[PDB]
Structures are given as structure tokens and as C-alpha cells.
């Protein structure tokens, strides 16, 4: 990433910090995956495990040409009213090694029993007995409240923060910003 863009969410009374950050992340998601690009990634510089929050600002690490069209895109723009956004600035030469990733799992035994019974064509009791109480697992890390078509109320967002390392392996990132198996510049 040759250009880092820092989006600082300005406090607003109309919306709360959690809802504001959730909306910003959701809007950015469509502004990056649909926009294209070889490597698209963001990190929460304000991430703190004490408050269990997702941070009050985000840093998008991308190339210069990628950010040139990303910031220019109307979808990624227009929210300057509630969020203070600057221009690209060269990141400092020293950078740490951190890889942010997402955990995909189901915490409901019913969904698992249904998925199992829908493959081998088992019975209701066969699917129920095959799913025990030990199959319900979920991340306990801080999860921002995101309300969308997935859940009516605030849905948790599972975000895993990679431990700080010395060696930083870069590379092409996912379309939605998921970990591609390499750390990202930490600065």
C-alpha cells in the first residue's frame, strides 16, 4: 500500500458511534469490492480491547492509483458531512506486522442440524441427535452492532486482530477486505 487514507468518524448526535461505524463500513464495502482493485484492506487504528469497541477511525491501505478512483467514486464519498476525511499521505517507513481476519461459524444448533439433514437426507431425530450442545461456538471479541437484512436487531461483527509481529508479508487482499494470509502495514 503506497497510499494510506485515514477516515475519522466525527461524533454525531443523530447517530451513535456503533451505528455510525457500522454504516461507514457497510458503505465502504460496496465502494471497494464493486470498484475493483488488486489489494484492498483497512485496519482500525483506534482498536482497543478495554472498551470492546471497533475504534473511532479507520485506515485504508491501498495503492495510489487505487485510492485515486476509490476516493473519487461517489459511493465511497458523500458522507463527508458526518465523517472528516483528508487526502492521501505517505505512510511512515517503519511498519508493524498485523493481519486482520474474519471468523465464519454458526452458533445455532438448529442451522447445523438442518444443513446436515439436507445433505444425507436424514430424519428430524437423526439430525437433532447428531448435533450436540458442544457444536455451538462463537467469537467473544469485540463485535460492532450491525443491523441489516441478516438480523433485525444489532448483529455482532466478528473481527479478529492479528498479533503484532516483526516480519510483514504483504500481498493481494480479499475483495471485502478479509485476511488473504498476510499482515498489513501497522503505523
Amino acid at each position: 500500500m503506497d497510499h494510506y487514507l485515514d477516515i475519522r468518524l466525527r461524533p454525531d448526535p443523530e447517530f451513535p458511534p456503533a451505528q455510525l461505524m457500522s454504516v461507514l463500513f457497510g458503505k465502504l464495502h460496496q465502494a471497494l469490492v464493486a470498484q475493483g482493485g488488486d489489494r484492498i484492506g483497512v485496519s482500525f487504528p483506534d482498536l482497543d480491547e478495554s472498551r470492546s469497541r471497533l475504534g473511532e477511525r479507520l485506515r485504508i491501505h491501498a495503492s495510489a492509483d487505487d485510492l485515486r478512483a476509490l476516493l473519487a467514486r461517489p459511493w465511497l464519498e458523500g458522507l463527508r458531512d458526518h465523517l472528516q476525511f483528508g487526502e492521501p499521505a505517505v505512510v511512515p517507513h517503519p511498519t508493524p506486522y498485523r493481519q486482520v481476519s474474519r471468523v465464519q461459524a454458526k452458533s445455532n444448533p438448529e442451522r447445523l442440524r438442518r444443513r446436515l439433514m439436507r445433505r444425507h437426507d436424514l430424519s428430524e431425530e437423526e439430525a437433532r441427535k447428531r448435533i450436540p450442545d458442544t457444536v455451538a461456538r462463537a467469537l467473544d471479541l469485540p463485535f460492532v452492532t450491525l443491523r441489516s437484512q441478516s438480523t433485525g436487531q444489532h448483529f455482532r461483527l466478528f473481527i479478529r486482530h492479528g498479533p503484532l509481529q516483526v516480519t510483514a508479508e504483504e500481498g493481494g487482499f480479499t475483495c471485502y477486505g478479509l485476511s488473504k494470509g498476510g499482515f498489513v502495514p501497522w503505523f
Partner: protein, 290 residues
Amino acid sequence: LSTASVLAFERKLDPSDALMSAGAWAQRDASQEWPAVTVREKVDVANLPSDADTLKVRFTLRVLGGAGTPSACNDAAYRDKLLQTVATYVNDQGFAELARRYAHNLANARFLWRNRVGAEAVEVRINHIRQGEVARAWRFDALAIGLRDFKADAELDALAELIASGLSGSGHVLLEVVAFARIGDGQEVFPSQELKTLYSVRDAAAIHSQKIGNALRTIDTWYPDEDGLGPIAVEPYGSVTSQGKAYRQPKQKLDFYTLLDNWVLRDEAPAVEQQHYVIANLIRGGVFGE
């Protein structure tokens, strides 16, 4: 000359419920016959019709006037003193500042709480209904108009003048506000949650009258400390639910009760900012005294 144990001020600029519907930008010319959005279950959720990319909100607003005129007062001396102070303030300077701030708030989409989030184009149309006829209309753009910055415009000045006149009691004033926000096909609206039950009237989604008047009265911009948040809904003790912090604490002299008590008993006219905040609170109305 002590205060009255019983004091109440009827609210002014009280709007009504805001009906919501869906349609296409092409149909904006003739909004008539736009199908409404009915609440559905999945909890309760509300989504635009199968083929609809623009949301519409329609709400009226009335200007009663006589803000300073108290509705009930135990002591006559206190009522006379308050009326005298109000007349003096109006003579010295008019409400044109409050009217201008209200006009900007109505022009922009500050009222929408969640609907504005993710809106590409928000077009507001404020009409004027006099004797049942549309005397004069106005059309603005919430996106083009700065949310955190106040800019002067001929239409905004005219609206502020009309509001000031109505508040002063020149004549009846009725304004029909209609907003159109482009969100997207099949999007999910965020109506006012009821105590998940979504607020619906006549099998149509809407927003609470008080919930609208709360944002519309965001005229408190004279707080002692500013962190860049912007206007905060006028409330006693400058309380904020989302921020969880209450600005303008009673310990300071900016408190509404303290300012009014001083400007009434000691006749101490506070800074223009404090006077504006006090007039805004009196216009909003409430229960004071004991």
C-alpha cells in the same frame, strides 16, 4: 418576588406525524397515487415495494405564536415581568436568527435520523398553505446544502421571515414538507421502533411527531465547549442520549434555569447566545418551577 411553584409553557412549532411512501424519481413530478409501504414480519421489518428506488416522507408544520406568552402562572407579577422581558428582547432584536436556523434545518435532511444514512439524492420541497391554497413553494437540496455549515439564500431568508411573522402572530402559517431520498431498490427503511414493533398508522409506516420535532429543534449551537459534533437537539441540561454526556451542566452559568432566574429576578441580560438558547427553550415549551 419569588418564582411560581407551577409554571408551564405550551410548545410552539409542533409538527404532526410523517407519512411515508415509495416511488421513482421520474414520478416526483406527480407524487399523487404513490403506493404506501406496509409493515411486514420476517421481529418486524419494512422494505420498499418490489420496484421502488426512492422513499418519500410527507409531514405538515404549523406556527402557533405567542412563545413568550405563558400558559399558566401562579403569580401575576412573575407573568408580567416575563412578558415585559420578552417584549424588550423582541424590540431589541427579532427572532430572525432562530427562524433562519429552523429554515436551514427544514431545508437539509437533519430531521431524518436513519433514512438520510446512505442517501445519494435528497430533495426537499416546502410548500406554504394559506386559506387552503398553495401561496408559495420552495425546493431545496439537502445534499448540496451544507449539514454543518449555514449558508444564506433568498428562499431561506424568505422562509425565516415567514416563520418569524407567524411566531410574532401576524397570521396563520402552514408548511407542507415533502422529502424524496434515493436509497435503492428493495432497501430496508428504519421507521420509529415501538415498545420489535415498527410504528405504523393506517397500515402505513411513519415517524413520531415528537421524534420529528426533536431533530427540527436542533437550534442549540452556543454550548460552552464544541468538539465539532454540530447542532444538538435543544434539551434541558444539554443532555445527549447517543453521546451519553450532558453539556451545559448546572454548575456553570449557561444553564437555562439559572440564566432565566438571573435575567428575571436580577434583570441581568446574558450574552446574545444565552438569550437565544433561553428563547429557544421557551418556544419549545415545558414544565418549570416546582
